[PDB]
Design a protein around this ligand. Sequence first.
Ligand SMILES: O=C(CO)N[C@H]1[C@H]([C@H](O)[C@H](O)CO)O[C@@](O)(C(=O)O)C[C@@H]1O
Ligand SMILES: O=C(CO)N[C@H]1[C@H]([C@H](O)[C@H](O)CO)O[C@@](O)(C(=O)O)C[C@@H]1O
Ligand SMILES: O=C(CO)N[C@H]1[C@H]([C@H](O)[C@H](O)CO)O[C@@](O)(C(=O)O)C[C@@H]1O
Ligand SMILES: O=C(CO)N[C@H]1[C@H]([C@H](O)[C@H](O)CO)O[C@@](O)(C(=O)O)C[C@@H]1O
Ligand SMILES: O=C(CO)N[C@H]1[C@H]([C@H](O)[C@H](O)CO)O[C@@](O)(C(=O)O)C[C@@H]1O
Lengths: 117, 120, 116, 117, 116
Amino acid sequence: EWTGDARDGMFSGVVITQFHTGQIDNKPYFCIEGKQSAGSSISACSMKNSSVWGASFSTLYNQALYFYTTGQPVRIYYEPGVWTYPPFVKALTSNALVGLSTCTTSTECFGPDRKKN
Amino acid sequence: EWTGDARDGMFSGVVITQFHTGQIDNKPYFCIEGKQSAGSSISACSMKNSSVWGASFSTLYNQALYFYTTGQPVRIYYEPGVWTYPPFVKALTSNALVGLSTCTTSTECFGPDRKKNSLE
Amino acid sequence: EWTGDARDGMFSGVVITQFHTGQIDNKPYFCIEGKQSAGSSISACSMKNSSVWGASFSTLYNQALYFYTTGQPVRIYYEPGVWTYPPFVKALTSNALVGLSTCTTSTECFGPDRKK
Amino acid sequence: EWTGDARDGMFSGVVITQFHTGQIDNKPYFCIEGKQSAGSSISACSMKNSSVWGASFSTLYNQALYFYTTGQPVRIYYEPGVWTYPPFVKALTSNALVGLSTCTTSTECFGPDRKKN
Amino acid sequence: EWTGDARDGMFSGVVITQFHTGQIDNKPYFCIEGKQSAGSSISACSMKNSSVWGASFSTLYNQALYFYTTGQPVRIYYEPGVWTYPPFVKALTSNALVGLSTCTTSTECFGPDRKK
Ligand SMILES: O=C(CO)N[C@H]1[C@H]([C@H](O)[C@H](O)CO)O[C@@](O)(C(=O)O)C[C@@H]1O
Ligand SMILES: O=C(CO)N[C@H]1[C@H]([C@H](O)[C@H](O)CO)O[C@@](O)(C(=O)O)C[C@@H]1O
Ligand SMILES: O=C(CO)N[C@H]1[C@H]([C@H](O)[C@H](O)CO)O[C@@](O)(C(=O)O)C[C@@H]1O
Ligand SMILES: O=C(CO)N[C@H]1[C@H]([C@H](O)[C@H](O)CO)O[C@@](O)(C(=O)O)C[C@@H]1O
Ligand SMILES: O=C(CO)N[C@H]1[C@H]([C@H](O)[C@H](O)CO)O[C@@](O)(C(=O)O)C[C@@H]1O
């Protein structure tokens, strides 16, 4: 697996506006929310030691909190349908956070595309 | 367990005003105090490798110190009665810190509620 | 053991003015010095993986550097007579750093008392 | 191996302008891009626990994020042809980030040279 | 071994002006350079998992970058002759970075002397 696999999905030019940290089944996690210029929203969580994407927890937490601080538009890479506990999904999201990138415009960001072919 | 379990409890729109760090029984811990809009205090502690919320010590420590620094109003998620050692509970609190969120208002915050259901 | 044990000691309303990091016996350590408004001085060191207080090294280092940075008055919790290598005691202190707290006044600070 | 080995290569006086963070094969990696002025581009990635240069991940992550933040001109030490997963190389680079230095001019920087004879 | 052992050496009132980070033989290292007002110069490296001073790499890294950022005059504790690989010594230095202190003056700084 790779952040840049040809899959859903990515949102570009988002400002990270909300941040949550919790624990579930002995695993710390965090979630972010961001809006695009046009008002469109994306949420994604990263959980320590959980899923394929568990290895990225610390790096993503650090980078997410950095970008939440600067408030610069970034690209959120995510994978839908990873989290399955229904209370969790309802309150938050099923989307795993799978990478992050700075952006030069609202559509053009540094790094791979993550789109279904 | 889960931060968002329908249990006590949460305090929304809290400003983290006080920060303490210590050690008990070979385990580092930190405690925070925050104020709500009307002047009431909340306190909650996280302890490394403790009972059920110990796995979140590092994340919570970093996030709480971060929010202390910004002075942002935030949601404190806690579980009452976790710490049982009387001198500790007396000086500090029995509350474990189990989560944190940013808030859009003094009352509306990102993430799950941590709240007991009502009886209809 | 506990930071809040009824033991020596604590200094409240201290601004951390000095900071030192080094190594002894394959362990990193740090020391801080601070003065109260009253000019009364306090030094205390934390050592990584040390006997009793070593589990706290990482949190205390983080918090102490943080407090050194803001310049805010804080409570220094300490245990005297912990470090014993004589050249180390002589140059620095025997005091272990055992906790830290923010303060509201020169005497009132968040957290427990540490006093006999 | 050593950052300052006489091989390809280094780019001096680079301002880091782009930052990307992702995961591949159970490993977090970050990737940076900078401009010399000059005006030409260098990208390099570091990856946690990667084979040769993985020991340096956490140090380089910190240091690169630091330098991205200050915007100061820095030396990027790189090793070409390290990353080999072709879609990764295509979207990003094959270059491993193997060192960083502060610079006094566009060309003069602290530390070893990394260049072939 | 100790930062405060009666050996070479230390330079007081040094502003850390240059910073380098790299890897050699599967170990990360960083090096700093600084000048002390009269313009006398000092270089020192810390390397993770080296036989003697390796334990303090990440603490010294953190502290030195912190001091590079504030630009305050500090004390550099070093031990000469630690790095032996000749191209490394030629490009950088043989000096191990052994400790760091805040300073109150260009000559007086917090902590032990490291003096032969
Ligand atoms: O189709 C999806 C599903 O995640 N995402 C696309 C994404 C979304 O359709 C769009 O951002 C929603 O507003 O648009 C992109 O232009 C982008 O934001 O980078 C490309 C991206 O593939
Ligand atoms: O009743 C409790 C027990 O913790 N908590 C409630 C809590 C407290 O009653 C209140 O914060 C204390 O004044 O009020 C809430 O409006 C909130 O702050 O989110 C709802 C929350 O469920
Ligand atoms: O006597 C000692 C020895 O540490 N400490 C006391 C301490 C010192 O006497 C005082 O701070 C020294 O100036 O005064 C306290 O009011 C405080 O600073 O919190 C109470 C504390 O027990
Ligand atoms: O030839 C290469 C291949 O990395 N790089 C050289 C590099 C390139 O010629 C230059 O950066 C243009 O890409 O110039 C240097 O002056 C430098 O930037 O330090 C020396 C460096 O060895
Ligand atoms: O002899 C050495 C070898 O490092 N260093 C001395 C050192 C150097 O001679 C001096 O810093 C070089 O300008 O001067 C000191 O005043 C100091 O800077 O603390 C004392 C120190 O022991």
